[PDB]
Design a protein around this nucleic acid. Structure first.
Lengths: 54, 105, 245, 159
RNA sequence: GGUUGCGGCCAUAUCUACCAGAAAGCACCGUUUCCCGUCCGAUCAACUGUAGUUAAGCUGGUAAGAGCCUGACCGAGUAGUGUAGUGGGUGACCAUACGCGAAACUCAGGUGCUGCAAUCU
RNA sequence: GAAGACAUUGUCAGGUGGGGAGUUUGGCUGGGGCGGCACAUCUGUUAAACGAUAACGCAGAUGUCCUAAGGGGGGCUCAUGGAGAACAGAAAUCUCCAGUAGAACAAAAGGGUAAAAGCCCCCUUGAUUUUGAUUUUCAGUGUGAAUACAAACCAUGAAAGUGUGGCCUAUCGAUCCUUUAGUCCCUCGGAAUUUGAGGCUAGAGGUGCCAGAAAAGUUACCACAGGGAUAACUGGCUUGUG
RNA sequence: GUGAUUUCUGCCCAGUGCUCUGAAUGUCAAAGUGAAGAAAUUCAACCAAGCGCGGGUAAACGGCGGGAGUUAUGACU
RNA sequence: GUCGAAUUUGGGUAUAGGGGCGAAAGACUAAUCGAACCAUCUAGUAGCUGGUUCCUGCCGAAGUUUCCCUCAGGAUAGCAGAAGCUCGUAUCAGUUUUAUGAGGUAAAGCGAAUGAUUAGAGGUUCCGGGGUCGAAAUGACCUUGACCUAUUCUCAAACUUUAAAUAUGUAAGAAGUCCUUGUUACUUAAUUGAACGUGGACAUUUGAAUGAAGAGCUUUUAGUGGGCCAUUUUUGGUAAGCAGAACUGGCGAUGCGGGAUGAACCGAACGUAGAGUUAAGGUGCCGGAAUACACGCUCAUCAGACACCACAAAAGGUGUUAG
RNA sequence: CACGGACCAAGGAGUCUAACGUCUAUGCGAGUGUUUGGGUGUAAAACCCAUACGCGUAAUGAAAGUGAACGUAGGUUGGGGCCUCGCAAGAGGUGCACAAUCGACCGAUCCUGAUGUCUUCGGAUGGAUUUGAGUAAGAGCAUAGCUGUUGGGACCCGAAAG
């Protein structure tokens, strides 16, 4: 009727993988002010490097 | 029961956006609504033949009534609403929810 | 596997009253001369009997003394007989509303009609107008519905003025009474000059218990079929008559 | 039907340890959490707001966002046949800092310093730690004492 | 080292009885116009270090007192328990081998450490 | 001859109308039905230390009640026991001493709460508005509930902060259609104005068989395409001394 | 509807049925009349039979208890 | 059984299907009648029984989740192939270890906390659901609890200082550390913090073990959705091959050697042949193999002889042997 | 002791279309498709051809409408390959598609409003943890084939009924 039999077998038949832990997680789920600061900071760094190199 | 009718809480006055004049009402009896599409079509479907055809909740499992609680503003009136407790039974009147309902002790 | 007769009585009332009334009735009648056992359940109690004649006699007496619908069934184990009994879900003082068909069938009485006599034929009294109506248990079984009111919305009141009208049957009926909420007696300016049937049993400055209609948590469907213009706001039930000496 | 409450089957776990009732000490609040920090989960019955699901006792997560008096933790969950990323909001008082990272950093600094010293002195050195190996040949000399005799004890008169 | 203020660790820091703490310091102390609250200056509010204070609290020692906390070649490889057998017994079960590993009682020791600033013939 | 602007005649409308026409009679289930809701839920145990985990098992409770029993802050400490004190009663009235919770915290139960989350006070409406993500029963869908952030406003407090409904675990609802409310929002399409209607995030009216048909009996006069029948082996039960 | 052939063939109009040489102002459709709107329309009143009240009906469906009351009381309320 | 009548029958005539007909049986209506036959719609409908035709090679299931007026039925997820795609040793692991967590389950907790039970003894508004009712409220009601009145004991799944192994999580690095300083509308009294940065220093001993028969990714659709048995721990039922639960293994799909034979037991998993060695099991004969070696026990007038499994209690026996 | 099987011969059951999903092959390519139709002919073949029209080259709302670049059509991390250095080891330069992420732009919803105005219409600019099947030097069309799905009688045979 109700049983969790063979669930482990089904799970391990093909193997279990990690969520791939992609680096640079999306700014989703953090402070919007933090996101705005991040965008402004990266824009400023890009401007600074572009001015520096030529 | 009782609900507040006029209050100084958040509204949309386009001039204040503060705790100021507020209004709310109760459900109003269903109009004849001859031009309304619903009963407009229901009348012809019923009058065709077979008598009653559209499914009807004959049994008394449902007995609920309606209330219309709204974020009304006397400045102007258009499509809007206010959310309150689930309306198993609600009405209008009260004037800031008094109805002699204060818990004296 | 030696019962051979099961009698089961059920009702869907949170506060059973007719159950205890019939229990007191049968105890005073000493009808349990052959009751082999009694089983207790939260929704009611059941009886077991070994003699089919005794079981059918008991069910017939119960049917005669209280309105109930009965049904029989057989269980093969060898053979046993089981009985299912249903009683009217209306209590003594529960306000009840009826559809237009039953209303016109029972003398065109108002939907706002109370009850005052739980017996073989279920009685109905209109507080608005002194009039007695009666309904058949078979009619109720053919037309099942939920009761309009319950005993969970009772309100106490105090009567200040009583004025007669001149129409009564057996209890000085149809008297105007100035009823006020007991809760707000300290500070209030609202009262109800309502005509009720508790004329000869209520006096000035007495504590009564009744229903409430104005802003009570009332959520019926067929109630919408009755115009609000003819819906009384306050109706009484009984009084406390607290003893002093 | 088996009811599935939010806090069902947790009567023993949703309790503070013995002789430590009352309000919590203030040390749990002063500690600082930042991105990359490794944290563990343990609830408490004094604070009822922002506490995680019963599935999350003794579970390790990573800090990825911090709010006023609240932090965010990323955990890995085994459902079906895949590992899913779960994000939880945890209050400060139900988070225990992990000393694993602390001692890891301590030993990282220690081995960095020893590598610098080895490079300074000019010869190579071994870095990787190794589990202890079995014993080495030794000589057991008994001059101040002598071996004695041991034998099994009979069960007679004692049974 | 003595305090005082502000704390971290949360009984090694608690309860019962004594003992001691020289101008360095803790609290009483008396009073009510002003701000304040109740039935009242009992707490709180404010007012100044005189005529008196260490009988308080607090700070410490001791109790062949209670309790608590650290270890045990104390209680034991004990109870327990994972891996195995075509091991035994008709069973209830019991030993075996490769492992891991308890706890009440008893004994040993103690009745706080530490952070910043200021004051003390 | 009798009768007459009456009947009858055609249409519409109300009532009566198993005489007849079509249908229906839930699900789980130690046969069915009855009884019950194990059909949506909640606490513990069942249930064997992540978690998940059966039974028509048991102890059991829900379809509510609250403008305060919510928000803020302030002061006070409860049951009980002892000592007492004209009328005082075993307990009513007032004080002191002990008292880590033996009371109380709406409801059932279990967690948590002692200069408070309790008792008493003064003030307020954050049970606000506009749109997301996450978490729980999960398919990573929704329904149900919670999480703390961001954008404005307010309450309380001296201030730090606290307040997005009930200290926490349950208290409840899609499509179609109907009723009144924001920028007086859009269209009614040959071109205009006004009634009217239909146009939109969110919000009532419900579906308890609770991811939601509109519903009463009998067949032994039966048919129908199928499945099950039936006493010879309990884990060795079985015969003589409650 | 019983079923020839003798003696008797008791009582009861609560309810479901059936019927009425009674009053109406309750329920009230269509059409028509009134008000307001410029109108589409909403409401008001009157509104037939029946439904309702009352009367009759039981060789129509049907029913024919217990108690106080005095231990049995065809005394008996 | 009646046979002179309500008798039988001829010929003609009437009544044709939801109709006729019926001295009434649900009888008859062309051998079909509780709705005739005929042909059309029609190849009606089926979640239901019954069949479904050449070979070989390769891979290899599930009887489980959620929902549905759903329990013989379907979609979602899971397995499998195929088509492959991106890289090709970079990245990981059903494992152990180092260190770090949480749990309250075994057992003896009772003079470190709470405590029944079945057995039924009273109490003066120190009190309660109510009864039928009630011209009242100075008004009658029957029964548990109102009240333990004066008292004993054990542990338990709803309780106690701790507290095991099996089982579960994270970490064990260059996507790093360190140094200087670049950015902002975040925050900070303060270039102080937060994040991300350029340049510079640290490559094989780059941060435990071992392993890797290449690693990762996408679309896809058949079947699947009634299990059983064994080991341990058990739940209800008095006990059961009864009803039901957790891990692993097996049958389902799986033959082979052995228990003479049993789907499940022990080994062992299989292309086609040769040689050798063995697993479990056996070595008097059937039956291949020592009527081997050695130690001691047993006389049964129903003996006795291989585990799951086809048998067993206590107790008695100058039977016997050893203590 | 469940079902069918006396034997033998012959017949026999996943079929075709309308609509498409994935993959593959082919031609063309920001275009693509001759065959409804006309001319021509050895005559149901094949040969040649115009205007239209389907599909796509833009999404959006309820629509009235708007309409896709602040920059070598962007930044951050790897990436086969290519080039330079050096015989080797290796480093540096560039880095498509591809993978995550931060942007930017266009639409819907909610805010804020400048020269003007026919005085209340016009809606530039700048914002909003919102929302979209979008753009960011386009890829689809046409045919055929395997498989698969829906209605067709729909793998074959079968009723109690109307």
């Amino acid at each position: 009727n109700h049983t969790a039999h063979n669930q482990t077998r089904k799970a391990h038949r093909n193997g279990i993988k990690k969520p791939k832990t992609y680096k640079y997680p999306s700014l989703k789920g953090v402070d919007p002010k933090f996101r705005r600061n991040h965008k402004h900071a990266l824009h400023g760094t890009a401007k600074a490097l572009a001015a520096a190199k030529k | 029961v009782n609900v507040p009718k006029t209050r100084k809480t958040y509204c949309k006055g386009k001039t204040c956006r503060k705790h100021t004049q507020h209004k709310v009402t109760q459900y109003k009896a269903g109009k004849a609504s001859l031009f309304a599409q619903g009963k407009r079509r229901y009348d012809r479907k019923q009058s065709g033949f077979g008598g009653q055809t559209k499914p009807v909740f004959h049994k008394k499992a449902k007995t609920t009534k309606k209330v219309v609680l709204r974020l009304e503003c006397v400045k102007c009136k258009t499509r809007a609403q206010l959310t309150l407790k689930r309306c198993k039974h609600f009405e209008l009147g009260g004037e800031k929810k008094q109805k002699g309902q204060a818990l004296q002790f | 596997n030696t019962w051979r007769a099961t009698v089961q009585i059920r009702q869907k009332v949170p506060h059973k009253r007719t159950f205890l009334f019939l229990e007191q009735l049968i105890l005073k009648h000493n009808a349990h001369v052959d009751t082999i056992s009694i089983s207790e359940a939260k929704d009611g109690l059941d009886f077991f009997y070994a003699q089919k004649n005794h079981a059918v006699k008991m069910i017939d007496f119960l049917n005669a003394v209280v309105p109930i619908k009965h049904k029989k069934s057989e269980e093969l184990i060898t053979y046993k007989f089981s009985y299912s009994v249903e009683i009217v879900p209306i209590c003594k003082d529960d306000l009840v509303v009826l559809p237009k068909k039953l209303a016109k069938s029972m003398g065109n009485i108002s939907q706002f009609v109370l009850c005052s006599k739980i017996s073989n034929t279920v009685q109905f009294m209109d507080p608005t107008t002194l009039q007695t109506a009666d309904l058949s248990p078979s009619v109720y079984w053919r037309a099942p519905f939920n009761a309009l009111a319950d005993v969970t919305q009772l309100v106490e009141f105090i009567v200040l003025d009583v004025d007669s009208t001149g129409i009564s049957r057996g209890n000085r009926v149809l008297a105007d009474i100035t009823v006020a909420r007991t809760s707000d007696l300290g500070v209030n300016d609202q009262v109800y000059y309502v005509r009720s049937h508790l004329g000869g049993i209520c006096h000035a400055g007495d504590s009564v218990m009744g229903y409430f209609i104005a802003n009570s948590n009332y959520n019926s469907d067929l109630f919408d079929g009755l115009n609000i213009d003819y819906v009384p706001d306050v109706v009484l039930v009984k009084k406390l008559y607290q003893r002093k000496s | 039907g088996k009811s599935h409450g939010y806090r069902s089957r947790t009567r023993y776990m949703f309790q503070r340890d013995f002789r430590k009732h009352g309000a919590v000490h203030l040390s749990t609040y002063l500690k600082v959490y930042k991105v990359g920090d490794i944290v563990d989960i343990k609830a408490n019955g004094s604070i009822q707001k922002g506490m995680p699901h019963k599935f999350y006792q003794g579970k390790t997560g990573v800090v990825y966002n911090v709010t006023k008096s609240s932090v965010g933790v990323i955990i890995n969950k085994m459902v079906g046949n895949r590992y899913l990323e779960k994000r939880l909001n945890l209050r400060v008082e139900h988070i225990k800092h992990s000393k694993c990272r602390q001692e890891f950093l301590e030993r990282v600094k220690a081995n960095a310093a020893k590598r610098a010293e080895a490079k300074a002195q000019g010869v190579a050195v071994q870095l990787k730690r190794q589990p202890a190996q079995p014993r080495e040949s030794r000589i057991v000399s008994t001059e101040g004492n002598v071996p004695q005799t041991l034998a099994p004890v009979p069960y007679e008169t004692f049974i």
